[PDB]
Design a protein around this nucleic acid. Structure first.
Ligand SMILES: [Mg+2]
Ligand SMILES: [Mg+2]
Ligand SMILES: [Mg+2]
Ligand SMILES: [Mg+2]
Ligand SMILES: [Mg+2]
Ligand SMILES: [Mg+2]
Ligand SMILES: [Mg+2]
Ligand SMILES: [Mg+2]
Ligand SMILES: [Mg+2]
Ligand SMILES: [Mg+2]
Ligand SMILES: [Mg+2]
Ligand SMILES: [Mg+2]
Ligand SMILES: [Mg+2]
Ligand SMILES: [Mg+2]
Ligand SMILES: [Mg+2]
Ligand SMILES: [Mg+2]
Ligand SMILES: [Mg+2]
Ligand SMILES: [Mg+2]
Ligand SMILES: [Mg+2]
Ligand SMILES: [Mg+2]
Ligand SMILES: [Mg+2]
Ligand SMILES: [Mg+2]
Ligand SMILES: [Mg+2]
Ligand SMILES: [Mg+2]
Ligand SMILES: [Mg+2]
Lengths: 145, 69, 30, 206, 142, 60, 80, 63, 143, 67
RNA sequence: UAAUUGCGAUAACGAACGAGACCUUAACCUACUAAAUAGUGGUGCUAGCAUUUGCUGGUUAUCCACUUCUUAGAGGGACUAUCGGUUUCAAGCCGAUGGAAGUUUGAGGCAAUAACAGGUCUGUGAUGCCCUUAGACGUUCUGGGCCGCACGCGCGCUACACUGACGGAGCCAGCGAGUCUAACCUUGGCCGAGAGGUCUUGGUAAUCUUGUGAAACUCCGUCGUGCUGGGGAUAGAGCAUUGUAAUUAUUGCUCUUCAACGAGGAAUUCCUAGUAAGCGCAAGUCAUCAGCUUGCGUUGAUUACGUCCCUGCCCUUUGUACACACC
């Protein structure tokens, strides 16, 4: 029975990773406003961070915001297995990563620039504007954008 | 919009208004107040602690509570 | 090869989308 | 009520309100009457039955359809639009809840509230499409006692549905509001709102 | 020893449903569980129904072994409510008496929702040219 | 019931007219107990064209 | 040794149209004609005790555009 | 407001050039000394009761 | 007067055992059990992070009870469900193995099951008593 | 629509014209008779026939029938 | 009448084909023959709960009995029966009673006479003629292409959510398929979040996969009118299975990106009962790949039981200069 009051412990919009996280939506889903974090990740980040899930974003301490922010830096340290991660075994680095925030279009643009610089097919596709995977263009993808 | 944290002020409403209507449901609370539906559902759990409202039909889809006694 | 490909202008998608569609693409009758 | 038992349970709430009398889910069919002639022997509320679902057959004789309870008919016309077809079970629940709701809103008798809204929602005289001569016209024919039950359930179970769409409410709830409105000519009802506009077109071109 | 145990069955769609009715202490069990627990939910009274038209006291002296094979969660329901009432009359056929037996046949057929006569509805074969038995593919002419 | 469904049309013209053929295979067994001669006998005194008979020793 | 070829005669070639089959073949591949070959064959089958017969030839009959003369006689059924 | 009850006496043929209108005749329930033909919309059988609006008119053929 | 789990409501029974299991401290719940979806089909992990593994085990106990010997695979299919395939038609896809298998092995370290002939695990005599004992306490929930 | 074909009627008019007082208004017995006094290739027809010549009867005993 | 199906009318009489009959399949059988590859009853051996004898399991066979459910052989069964109402009171149609079944009992196989310059020479070691025959239009080998994308039409898939989505739990089909000079259907144990893997295993099959423990569905919850967790296109990153070979992504898996779509204009398809619709499943294809067909069962209705308004067809009549027949 979470019929709970508080007086100032709640606060709408708390900024995380230079993003804008709504305080009225449940934690797990509140955090997903950020690029790079889906519902799978945010369900797991908040588990290791000793955070009560029944809460809304607006609640939770700024040390509980600190636990979650930090775990997202390195999930690989808080017992979060690599197959949960969105940049594993980098092409130019060889380690595991989970890119976040502004850094999503970052390494993504890079990758595309990688098979643009090397001038390969899947990149040439990207460049041209057309599709990258072997699907048909005869009949589909029309109306553009 | 609505309301999903007990405004305390809008907690006072909940036990001084629910014995008014004799059909209190999941959305009854939602629309005569401005709850988030999630806290309408835990309003029910609450309002049936030492129940202000009396139940007749409990279900995962639907909730049916009458007035007092 | 690809060098000519990626570096070719007048051959992208803009240059295609710019173009008007042939008026004999909704026509039959043989 | 002389409550025997045997080697297997069988609860007293079953024992009593049953062998004594076949109520609904648990409402009594008796003392509920069709509050308008002509519609009786079409609004089947007499021979009693517990749940609103039976492996019956009403597509062999032409009028054998009315000899089924308006209860189980009210239900059948709920499971509509593709997403809902062939889900009687979800409607029987949808319905069983609906009579409970209505019985709360207005005390009374919930199986009556149904009937009271199935009668006052059947369009007396309608509107046909006569040849008219090109830019055709209409004619104010009258309508069957079976069509005042058929099209009755029609308009209703399209009032509860069409409302509770992108709306915060449930079907059993809007099927309790829309069955209470028309259960005394509210005009807030969907059914009434069309019914008394069919009787307007009829009176127009006779 | 071998006991007086009538046996009948009931079907609806593909659902076959065996029944064993001897002289017993009263238990009425489907599959391996009391007839109270038959929880396809709403359809509960659909199986209690044979027990009320004819009075609960007739079942005080009989053991009911029912079991359902095939069909669906809803067909098994009717499949058993049939065999259950189809053995009660079938006990009176033998061990009891004709006159009393036909108050049981009369209690049910005054109310027959299949009960002791099988609803011969089967499915219909799909034919080529559409997805359904009657439903055809969408034709486009031009 | 060995079933085969195919198109009537060689090539693909006209309504898509589907036709299916059956083959029906009927199995059955009989258990006998009898000495030396009756065994090779029954195989020979009960033989018929089209009918495929077989006798099994016992055990495994 | 474990496979034996046997040879019988025939249940009179007015009852097997497989026999009349290679019959029309040889007749025409003896430079005959339609009606003489066809009425011929049929008269055999008719006087073979059969209830009826039908011999139908399609293709280029008088050459040019192809035709299809049907030469039958007696009693035939079709449907069941 | 004059609300007419009327038991069906005999069902004639089926008019409306479409076919969804049935000719029928009735027995005025309170004044049995009556017999009027009105045009119907729904599937009507004999016996069952109509509710006549402008208790006159009495129509014929329909298209 | 002789309670069998075949007398008890499936929702009730398996909601209770799953609670008595959880307050029996020692089930041996795998290290992960907070990252898995129970199947490849499902979209999210089980929403009751704490005691679903108990529930799951609590289902298998009743399920191997009203039976003979069930296997690892048979369970994967019992549990596996319908599955969105995006813009494609749904098909049934089976469930996790390392979940159900680990449940059975760690149901033997408590003694509710055991490897039987023919394959898979049977219910144990040590455990057949355990259910009928705790089912009864569900059966007497009448104050 | 149930219209008994000629092959039926042409035999009903045929059993009456032969074996009359050996027949009766009953269906079941007449059905048995056909097995003796006639020969019919299929069980269903047998009855189909039987069921017409028994129709005629019930109006033969009511006023003669034309042919 | 569904029918040139009949009653009848009759310068026609009496017949043959077609329709009907017939064959298949789905419905009834406490009547006949049987069953360890199908089931049940008792009985041993054996487990749990109460110990009230009992409720519940286990033993592929301990012993015996039986054929209700199961399988398929042999027949029984229905004839629109019984009464009533109508109509030349004839063929028939309607209604109520019984009955497993009473719309050709439901659904199919088959199916005349005549016709088409419909379609197929790319199914054929079916075939005429022309072509072509070693710089081969024969063949085989390597790579590419059939999928190439400003766009117009067709069939389809998933959706717009609350009668929903997600998470637990509940748990029920039928039609089917499966390895000899092999590698198919695959339980079980173990390993792995997964997709998979590895070690064994049954089955040439009512015997083993399989009770195909399918899905929609049901319940308990979480979410709450928010383009929201409805929706899952686009794309990056990683791991796996098929195959000699995966790039122009085969497929699968995991995370991340989260677009259009807020019920669809003029126009149009299909449909009358276990049907429509929703649902998933086997089989075809298949090394691999179904959003496709061919079938199956699950859940299961609103409306109609009529008409010629429309669009097609058929019959009769009438016009004709058409007969290569209103292209
Ligand atoms: Mg995100
Ligand atoms: Mg488009
Ligand atoms: Mg249903
Ligand atoms: Mg189907
Ligand atoms: Mg035929
Ligand atoms: Mg399942
Ligand atoms: Mg499930
Ligand atoms: Mg999907
Ligand atoms: Mg004729
Ligand atoms: Mg014929
Ligand atoms: Mg056996
Ligand atoms: Mg009847
Ligand atoms: Mg041509
Ligand atoms: Mg070609
Ligand atoms: Mg192609
Ligand atoms: Mg097509
Ligand atoms: Mg989703
Ligand atoms: Mg679900
Ligand atoms: Mg078997
Ligand atoms: Mg979203
Ligand atoms: Mg997603
Ligand atoms: Mg990335
Ligand atoms: Mg396949
Ligand atoms: Mg294809
Ligand atoms: Mg003329």
């Amino acid at each position: 029975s979470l019929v709970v009051q508080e007086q100032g412990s709640f606060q709408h919009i708390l900024r995380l990773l230079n993003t804008n996280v709504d305080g009225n939506i449940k934690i797990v889903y509140a955090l997903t406003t950020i690029k790079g974090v889906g519902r799978r990740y945010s369900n797991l980040v908040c588990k290791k961070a000793d955070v009560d899930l029944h809460k809304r974003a607006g609640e939770l301490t700024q040390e509980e915001l600190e636990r979650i922010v930090q775990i997202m830096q390195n999930p690989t340290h808080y017992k979060i297995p690599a197959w949960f991660l969105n940049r594993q075994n980098d092409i130019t680095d060889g380690k595991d990563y989970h890119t976040l925030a502004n850094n999503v279009e970052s390494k993504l643009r890079d990758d595309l620039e990688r098979l643009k610089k090397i001038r390969a097919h899947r990149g040439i596709r990207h460049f041209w504007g057309l599709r990258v995977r072997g699907q048909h263009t005869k009949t589909t993808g029309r109306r553009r954008a | 919009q609505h309301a999903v944290i007990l405004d305390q002020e809008k907690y006072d409403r909940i036990l001084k208004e629910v014995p008014t209507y004799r059909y209190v449901s999941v959305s009854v609370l939602v629309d005569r107040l401005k709850i988030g539906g999630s806290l309408a559902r835990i309003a029910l759990r609450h309002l049936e602690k030492e129940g202000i409202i009396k139940p007749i039909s409990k279900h995962s889809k639907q909730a049916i509570y009458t007035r007092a006694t | 090869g690809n060098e000519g490909a990626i570096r070719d202008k007048t051959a992208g998608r803009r240059n295609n989308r710019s173009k008007d569609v042939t008026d004999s693409a909704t026509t039959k009758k043989s | 009520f002389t409550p025997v038992v045997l080697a297997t349970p069988i609860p007293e709430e079953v024992q009593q309100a049953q062998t004594e009398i076949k109520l609904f889910n648990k409402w009594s069919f008796e003392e509920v009457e069709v509050k308008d002639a002509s519609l009786v022997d079409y609004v089947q509320v007499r021979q009693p039955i517990f749940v609103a679902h039976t492996a019956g057959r009403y597509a062999n004789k032409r009028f054998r359809k009315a000899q089924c309870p308006i209860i189980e008919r009210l239900t059948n016309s709920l499971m509509m639009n593709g997403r809902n077809n062939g889900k009687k079970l979800k409607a029987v629940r949808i319905i069983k809840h609906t009579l409970d709701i209505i019985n709360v809103l207005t005390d009374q008798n919930p199986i009556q509230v149904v009937v009271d809204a199935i009668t006052n929602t059947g369009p007396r005289e309608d509107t046909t499409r006569v040849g008219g001569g090109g830019a055709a016209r209409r004619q104010a024919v009258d309508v069957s006692p079976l069509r005042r039950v058929n099209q009755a359930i029609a308009l209703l179970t399209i009032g509860a549905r069409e409302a509770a769409f992108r709306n915060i409410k449930t079907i059993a709830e809007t099927l309790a509001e829309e069955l209470i409105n028309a259960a005394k000519g509210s005009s807030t009802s969907y059914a009434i709102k069309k019914k008394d506009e069919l009787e307007r077109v009829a009176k127009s071109n006779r | 020893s071998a006991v007086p145990s009538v046996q009948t069955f009931g079907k609806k769609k593909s659902a076959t449903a065996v029944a064993h009715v001897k002289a017993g202490k009263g238990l009425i069990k489907v599959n391996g569980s009391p007839i109270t627990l038959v929880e396809p939910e709403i359809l509960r009274f659909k199986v209690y129904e044979p027990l009320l038209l004819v009075g609960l006291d007739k079942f005080s002296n009989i053991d009911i072994r029912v079991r359902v094979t095939g069909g669906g969660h809803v067909s098994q329901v009717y499949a058993i409510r049939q065999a259950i009432a189809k053995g009660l009359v079938a006990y009176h056929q033998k061990y009891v008496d004709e006159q009393s037996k036909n108050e049981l046949k009369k209690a049910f057929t005054s109310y027959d929702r299949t009960l002791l006569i099988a609803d011969s509805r089967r499915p219909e074969p799909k034919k080529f040219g559409g997805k359904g038995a009657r439903s055809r593919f969408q034709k486009s002419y031009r | 019931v060995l079933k085969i469904s195919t198109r009537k049309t060689p090539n693909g013209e006209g309504s898509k007219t589907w036709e299916t053929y059956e083959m029906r295979i009927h199995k059955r067994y009989i258990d006998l107990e009898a000495p030396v001669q009756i065994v090779k006998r029954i195989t020979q005194i009960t033989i018929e064209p089209g009918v495929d008979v077989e006798v099994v020793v016992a055990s495994n | 040794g474990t496979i034996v070829l046997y040879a019988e005669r025939v249940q009179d070639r007015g009852l097997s149209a497989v026999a009349q089959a290679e019959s029309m073949k040889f007749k025409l591949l003896n430079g005959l004609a339609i009606r003489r070959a066809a009425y011929g064959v049929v008269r055999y089958v008719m006087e073979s005790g059969a209830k009826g017969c039908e011999v139908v030839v399609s293709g280029k009959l008088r050459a040019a555009r192809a035709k299809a003369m049907k030469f039958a006689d007696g009693f035939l059924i079709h449907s069941g | 407001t004059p609300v007419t009850l009327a038991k069906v006496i005999k069902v004639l043929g089926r008019t409306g050039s479409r076919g969804g209108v049935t000719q029928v005749r009735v027995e005025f329930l309170e004044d049995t000394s009556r017999t009027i033909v009105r045009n119907v919309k729904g599937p009507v059988r004999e016996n069952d009761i109509l509710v006549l609006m402008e208790s006159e008119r009495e129509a014929r053929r329909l298209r | 007067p002789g309670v069998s789990v075949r007398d008890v409501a499936a929702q009730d029974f398996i909601n209770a055992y799953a609670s008595f299991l959880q307050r029996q401290g020692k089930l041996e719940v795998p290290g992960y059990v907070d990252i898995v979806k129970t199947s490849s089909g499902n979209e999210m992990p089980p929403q009751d992070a704490e005691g679903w593994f108990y529930k799951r085990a609590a289902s298998v106990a009743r399920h191997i009870y009203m039976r003979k010997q069930v296997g690892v695979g048979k369970l994967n299919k019992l549990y596996g469900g319908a599955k969105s395939r995006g813009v494609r038609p749904y098909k049934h896809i089976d469930a996790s193995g390392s979940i159900n298998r680990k449940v059975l092995q760690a149901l033997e370290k408590i003694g509710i099951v055991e490897i039987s002939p023919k394959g898979g695990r049977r219910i144990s005599e040590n455990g057949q008593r355990d259910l009928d004992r705790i089912a009864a306490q569900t059966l007497e929930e009448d104050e | 629509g149930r219209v008994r074909t000629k092959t039926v009627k042409r035999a009903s008019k045929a059993l009456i014209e032969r074996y009359y007082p050996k027949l009766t208004l009953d269906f079941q017995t007449n059905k048995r008779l056909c097995d003796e006094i006639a020969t019919i290739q299929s069980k269903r027809l047998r009855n189909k026939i039987a069921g017409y010549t028994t129709h005629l009867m019930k109006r033969i005993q009511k006023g003669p029938v034309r042919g």
